[PDB]
Amino acid sequence: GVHRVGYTHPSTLPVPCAQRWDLRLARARIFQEYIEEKAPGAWQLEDERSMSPEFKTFTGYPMRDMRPGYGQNLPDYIMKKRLPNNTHYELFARRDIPNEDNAMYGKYLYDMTVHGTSLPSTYRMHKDINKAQRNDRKLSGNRFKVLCSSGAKNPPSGWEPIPDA
Amino acid sequence: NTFLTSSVATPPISVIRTGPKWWADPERMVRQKLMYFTLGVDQLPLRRTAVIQRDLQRFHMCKPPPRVGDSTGYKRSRAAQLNTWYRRIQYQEYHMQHLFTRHVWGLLRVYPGNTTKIQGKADDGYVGYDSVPFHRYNRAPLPFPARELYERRK
Amino acid sequence: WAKPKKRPKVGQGFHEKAQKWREEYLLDRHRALADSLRAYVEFSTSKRVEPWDARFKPFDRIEKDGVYVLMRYMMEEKLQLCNYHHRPVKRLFCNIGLMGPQITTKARWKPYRFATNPAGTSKAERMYQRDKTVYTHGHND
Amino acid sequence: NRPEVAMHRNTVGLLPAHMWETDKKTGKVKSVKDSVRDYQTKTPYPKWVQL
Amino acid sequence: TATPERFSVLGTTHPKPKRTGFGRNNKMRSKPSDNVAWYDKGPVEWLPRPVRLTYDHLDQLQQWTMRATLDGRTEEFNRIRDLHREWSQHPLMPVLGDVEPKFPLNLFKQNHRAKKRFLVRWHKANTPANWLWMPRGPTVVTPLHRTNPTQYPENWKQMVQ
Amino acid sequence: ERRLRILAQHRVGMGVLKLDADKYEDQADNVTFGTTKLSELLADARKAQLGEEYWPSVELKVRKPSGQSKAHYSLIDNERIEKRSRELYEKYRDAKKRSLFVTPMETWLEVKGM
Amino acid sequence: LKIAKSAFGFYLARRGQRKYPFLRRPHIKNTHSMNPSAPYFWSFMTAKSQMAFLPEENYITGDWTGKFFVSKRQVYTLQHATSGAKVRVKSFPSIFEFNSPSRWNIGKEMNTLTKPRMDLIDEQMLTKKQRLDYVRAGLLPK
Amino acid sequence: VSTGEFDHPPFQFRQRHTFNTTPLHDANRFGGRTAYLREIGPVNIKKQGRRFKKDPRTVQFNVDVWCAQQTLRKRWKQRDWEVIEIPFRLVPREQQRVIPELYTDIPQMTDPARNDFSNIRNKVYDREELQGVLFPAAGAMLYPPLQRVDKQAMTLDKYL
Amino acid sequence: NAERFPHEYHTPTSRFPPTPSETPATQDWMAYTAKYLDKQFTISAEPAPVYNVNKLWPMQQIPGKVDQTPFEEDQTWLLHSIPVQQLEMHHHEKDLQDLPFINHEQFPRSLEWNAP
RNA sequence: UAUUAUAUUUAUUCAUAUAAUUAAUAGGAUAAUAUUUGUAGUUUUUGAUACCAUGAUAAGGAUUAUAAAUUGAAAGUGUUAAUAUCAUAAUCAAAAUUUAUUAUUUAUAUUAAAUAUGUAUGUGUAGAUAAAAUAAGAAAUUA
Numbered sequence A: 001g002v003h004r005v006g007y008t009h010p011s012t013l014p015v016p017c018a019q020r021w022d023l024r025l026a027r028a029r030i031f032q033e034y035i036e037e038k039a040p041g042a043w044q045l046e047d048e049r050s051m052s053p054e055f056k057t058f059t060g061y062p063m064r065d066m067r068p069g070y071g072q073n074l075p076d077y078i079m080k081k082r083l084p085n086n087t088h089y090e091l092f093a094r095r096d097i098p099n100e101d102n103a104m105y106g107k108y109l110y111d112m113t114v115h116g117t118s119l120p121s122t123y124r125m126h127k128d129i130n131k132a133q134r135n136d137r138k139l140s141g142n143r144f145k146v147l148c149s150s151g152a153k154n155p156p157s158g159w160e161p162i163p164d165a
Numbered sequence B: 001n002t003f004l005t006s007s008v009a010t011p012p013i014s015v016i017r018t019g020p021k022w023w024a025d026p027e028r029m030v031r032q033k034l035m036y037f038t039l040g041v042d043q044l045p046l047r048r049t050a051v052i053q054r055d056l057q058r059f060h061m062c063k064p065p066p067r068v069g070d071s072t073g074y075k076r077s078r079a080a081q082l083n084t085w086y087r088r089i090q091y092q093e094y095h096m097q098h099l100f101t102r103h104v105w106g107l108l109r110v111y112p113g114n115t116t117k118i119q120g121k122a123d124d125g126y127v128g129y130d131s132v133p134f135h136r137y138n139r140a141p142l143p144f145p146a147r148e149l150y151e152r153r154k
Numbered sequence C: 001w002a003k004p005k006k007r008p009k010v011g012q013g014f015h016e017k018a019q020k021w022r023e024e025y026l027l028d029r030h031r032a033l034a035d036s037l038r039a040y041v042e043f044s045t046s047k048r049v050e051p052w053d054a055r056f057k058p059f060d061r062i063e064k065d066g067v068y069v070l071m072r073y074m075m076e077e078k079l080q081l082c083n084y085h086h087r088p089v090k091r092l093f094c095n096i097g098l099m100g101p102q103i104t105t106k107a108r109w110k111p112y113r114f115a116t117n118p119a120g121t122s123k124a125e126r127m128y129q130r131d132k133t134v135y136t137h138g139h140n141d
Numbered sequence D: 001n002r003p004e005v006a007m008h009r010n011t012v013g014l015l016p017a018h019m020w021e022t023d024k025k026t027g028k029v030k031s032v033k034d035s036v037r038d039y040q041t042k043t044p045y046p047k048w049v050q051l
Numbered sequence E: 001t002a003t004p005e006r007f008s009v010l011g012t013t014h015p016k017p018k019r020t021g022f023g024r025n026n027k028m029r030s031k032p033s034d035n036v037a038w039y040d041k042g043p044v045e046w047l048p049r050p051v052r053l054t055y056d057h058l059d060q061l062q063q064w065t066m067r068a069t070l071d072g073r074t075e076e077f078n079r080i081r082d083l084h085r086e087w088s089q090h091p092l093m094p095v096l097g098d099v100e101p102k103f104p105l106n107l108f109k110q111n112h113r114a115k116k117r118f119l120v121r122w123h124k125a126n127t128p129a130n131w132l133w134m135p136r137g138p139t140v141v142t143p144l145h146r147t148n149p150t151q152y153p154e155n156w157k158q159m160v161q
Numbered sequence F: 001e002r003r004l005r006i007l008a009q010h011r012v013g014m015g016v017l018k019l020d021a022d023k024y025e026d027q028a029d030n031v032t033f034g035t036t037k038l039s040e041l042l043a044d045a046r047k048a049q050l051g052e053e054y055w056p057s058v059e060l061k062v063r064k065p066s067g068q069s070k071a072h073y074s075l076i077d078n079e080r081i082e083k084r085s086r087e088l089y090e091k092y093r094d095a096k097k098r099s100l101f102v103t104p105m106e107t108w109l110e111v112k113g114m
Numbered sequence G: 001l002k003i004a005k006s007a008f009g010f011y012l013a014r015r016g017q018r019k020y021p022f023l024r025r026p027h028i029k030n031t032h033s034m035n036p037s038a039p040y041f042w043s044f045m046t047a048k049s050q051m052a053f054l055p056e057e058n059y060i061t062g063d064w065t066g067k068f069f070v071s072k073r074q075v076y077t078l079q080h081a082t083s084g085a086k087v088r089v090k091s092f093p094s095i096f097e098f099n100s101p102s103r104w105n106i107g108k109e110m111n112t113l114t115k116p117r118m119d120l121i122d123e124q125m126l127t128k129k130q131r132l133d134y135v136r137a138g139l140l141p142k
Numbered sequence H: 001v002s003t004g005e006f007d008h009p010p011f012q013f014r015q016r017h018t019f020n021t022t023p024l025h026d027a028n029r030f031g032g033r034t035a036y037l038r039e040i041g042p043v044n045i046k047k048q049g050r051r052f053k054k055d056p057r058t059v060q061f062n063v064d065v066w067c068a069q070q071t072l073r074k075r076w077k078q079r080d081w082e083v084i085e086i087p088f089r090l091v092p093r094e095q096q097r098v099i100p101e102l103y104t105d106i107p108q109m110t111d112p113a114r115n116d117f118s119n120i121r122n123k124v125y126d127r128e129e130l131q132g133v134l135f136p137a138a139g140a141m142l143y144p145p146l147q148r149v150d151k152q153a154m155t156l157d158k159y160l
Numbered sequence I: 001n002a003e004r005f006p007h008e009y010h011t012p013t014s015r016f017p018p019t020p021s022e023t024p025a026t027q028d029w030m031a032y033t034a035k036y037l038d039k040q041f042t043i044s045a046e047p048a049p050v051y052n053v054n055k056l057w058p059m060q061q062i063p064g065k066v067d068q069t070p071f072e073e074d075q076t077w078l079l080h081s082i083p084v085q086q087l088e089m090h091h092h093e094k095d096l097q098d099l100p101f102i103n104h105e106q107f108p109r110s111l112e113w114n115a116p
Numbered sequence J: 001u002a003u004u005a006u007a008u009u010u011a012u013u014c015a016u017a018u019a020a021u022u023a024a025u026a027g028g029a030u031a032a033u034a035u036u037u038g039u040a041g042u043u044u045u046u047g048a049u050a051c052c053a054u055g056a057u058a059a060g061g062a063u064u065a066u067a068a069a070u071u072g073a074a075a076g077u078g079u080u081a082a083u084a085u086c087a088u089a090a091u092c093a094a095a096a097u098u099u100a101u102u103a104u105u106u107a108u109a110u111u112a113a114a115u116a117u118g119u120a121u122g123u124g125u126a127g128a129u130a131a132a133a134u135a136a137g138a139a140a141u142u143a
């Protein structure tokens, strides 16, 4: 039925008694509770699937609310929502990275403490060793590529590269 | 009748081959029987069918009896003859069901599914509100609103 | 997994062609929009065929009895105000309450596309004779 | 109004017929007049906005 | 704005062709098909369209049957009795060598349409008016059933001595 | 106790009041928080000792009137209604000389035209 | 991929015609974004509420030198028409300009004013094979 | 222990109207609600459709909302009563206790000592026995008192 | 003019099904009868318990707010303006574990683990 | 020849990718005292790149059978380890269909939250094709 919800103030009753709505406002002050003013009275729908022992999927709690339009957009959804801080997302952010040991310590630090020195990555070492091997037979299939070119283009006052044949 | 739309007809033998799943599903067979009984007519073919099929179901997990080879082929032909008998006993039933159902629908002022005959009322198939604007098999144009088989009072 | 072939270059003067084509596709779309709004509103405003399927009850009954009596004397004005559009018609029948639970349960209504025909529609072919130049989603006459 | 609820409440008064050009025989919109040149409004921004 | 007289590049493009046909890959013609009913053979169209008898219909049936009994209308009961008597007779045991034809192997591959197309076209040709293994006619002696209206219980007053 | 139960709803079970304090990152702060909510909830429940006005109401499911009561609905204003229905019968007898079908709206029902 | 239309042609596999979960396809290609509806005009591919504010992209947020094109989720405003300033949008091949201003655009996003897939096709961006396949589908004349 | 359908059928090859089979979004399922889910016709995949209408999870969610409505609806048609909030004094002896809120304790028996074991939750009171309490202002009783059957009286069923 | 178009301006606090405007005598048959049908009817309303009657229950509502009760009639549900789920669907807690198939788990605790 | 059956049922309009810089360590309240608050030495190298640059896991039924028992296989399907000697092409949104390798909703009621598909009614209708003996229900033409 379409009716006006109504409230009888206890001073007006022929016995004073504590009205359930009044109690509800108490409960809302204590655990601070948003009272949705536009909540339609007609829409009480339990989630049948999870709340009835008749379905194999029965958790005892209302897993989803059955409201078709409801979306991450709405201020109401935003107000009760778990922020991503310190969830698994953070755990992924930190522990899943390309070389897993760089999660535990600075490579240079480790290398310098354990070995006497910084060590190149395995890949780099491969390219290094290969250059040494193939520079020993053929020469001049090569190129000279640096980060900063000035050191080669104007070399120091000394520096007379040994002629090759 | 709630199911009104154009439909696809299946040959009787494939309908019967569904066995327990549809043709002999107990639930369905019982309300056929109800229709006949209510009209005050014995349901013999239904009972023959139910007998045959009941037994089909009972032995449905067994292997067939061992075959000895014969030049005669009398065994093979006798098995076949029995089989087509049973097939025909059931054709007769399948026919009865479609028959009486259409007739009863004629008495109840029911409109059949699209393109369906009801002997006294719609001789050519009855149609209204098809996806296609003409009668499918006549190739004649359909009137709006849907054609009425029965006089108005209820 | 083969190495992807390189895509050929774009075209010469195709940037102009694409600009012009989209430009006047949009200009055209303005009139297509204007016209389809005109159509949509013309449809909302104009009358429709009766939404209920007369082949079932309580509608089959002779037009001088039952539901038709209920309509001629109590509901007529309202049924005409809403132009027999099937949604408000069905709602009015719910609110008249003198039928009550039946509207959805026992009564049958015509399917969507048939119920949308203009009042006066004689042959079924009409569904297909409405204008296709206009973007109303079948809400146009 | 969209078709879901109030569609039958649409009025012919909503159409801006003066904005377009119609064909007499069909009853259809052939062309649209230009909107911008002659367009006068006292409210480019809402009334309460002073920049 | 101001819809132009000419459209340079708009209608310029090649028009999409109308489809020539229907169904799968738009290549199917409009012709008579196996699914087509025949209304010229017997009371049931053939092949029969699907039919769903509901408990709803059974209740309407009961009420019709009752209302008919109380108005002393014996006629539709008699048409129904007739129909039933005609088509419910016991079908005769087939002669050896008589079987329904199967579809020949080594004609099409096993997943081919032809298979079903054969079955349908066979059962379409044997209409229940062509079933000769069920004995219907005036010639038929019917031991299980009553012959005419005069033998049914609502005639009982004439059966009295 | 009744007031305590109604105030903390699903936070009571098997006659044990249970508050789960999650608000702050550190457990210390949650015992502070939890303890506070507890005393604040006790403070409000304890109002039932100030007088009856604070004793929470009982919710009874009270049936609609019975069949027996509803039977009298058809006798409400019996005299007036019979006396009136004779006049209405006159109105009907007269109206039925003019027109084939007499609606209640020509007799006792009012429908405002404009 | 078969043909590389961008860099990603090298990195990505098609995986045949593969199914993705509902409304998550890796690449957002809105072919439908201009899809005419008179009755749904204000609800389709627009803001779910008319009380929402216009997006970020209708505003100059910081100290700018200038932009090349404005974003396509920008909504067309009476000033877009009236001011007579360049309004560009990034479409393909290059850029679409709103040159001929109309009030009929107002209140919709430029997503909706720019046809993503044109009925116009360049024959010069097509291989002879691809042109054949476009003639089969009855698009290109030949 | 309902026999009704609570699950939307899985998408497959197109179902057609047959003996033993009906279309998926046929008007006879879910009380004709399937209207909301239906894309009519030979749908041209490339150009047309509404994606949510073929999606299993979305579709099933919608159906579940509809089922929930059905149950809610029938549970409310099942009520003949209102909840009235009556002060502790004036209430019958059985409610003078403490009554744990719903799902808080074990489902509770009204009066084990008086041989009544039933949910206090679902006990319903007659508007006529609470008359003095609910309408004190009225003077003369508004509802006439219930008439009750003598179970010691010799009546037709006692064979006299 | 916004109130003239009921389905057009939906703020994102608004909820379905919409509530119809109230009507004066509607709350029970006696009141209705008194006001509309038979106007000399002596009992203007059916006896009103002096204590509060909670018509939506168990749901508490704000007093003084015009409201609706869950519908008993199937038609009332079916023909109202309640929408169907259309986009992807969201849950304020469960969104953090993405989909049902990506079921994100920070720690491998037993699903039956019980907080002390 | 004994250790036992393919000729049944249901299907077939199948499309989707973009806006260049990968090179190292560094600790803080409730500690017996470090401004180490603020830790400052350009520049000699060249492959995984848009590019030749070996390895490795897929799919694909054809005769070890019933009892206390699984109807999925190794012969290799982009991403992985010794051949270098053209080039920064990589998603953080809102984007451009030609690609063999894909089960879509078909007529009582039909767009509310991330933006979400306007198109093909045509006698269930060519050719050609797909799937299954496993909690289901099918039975007789081996090498």
Ligand SMILES: [Mg+2]
Residues within 6 Å of the ligand: none
């Ligand atoms: Mg390999």
Ligand SMILES: [Mg+2]
Residues within 6 Å of the ligand: none
């Ligand atoms: Mg980068």
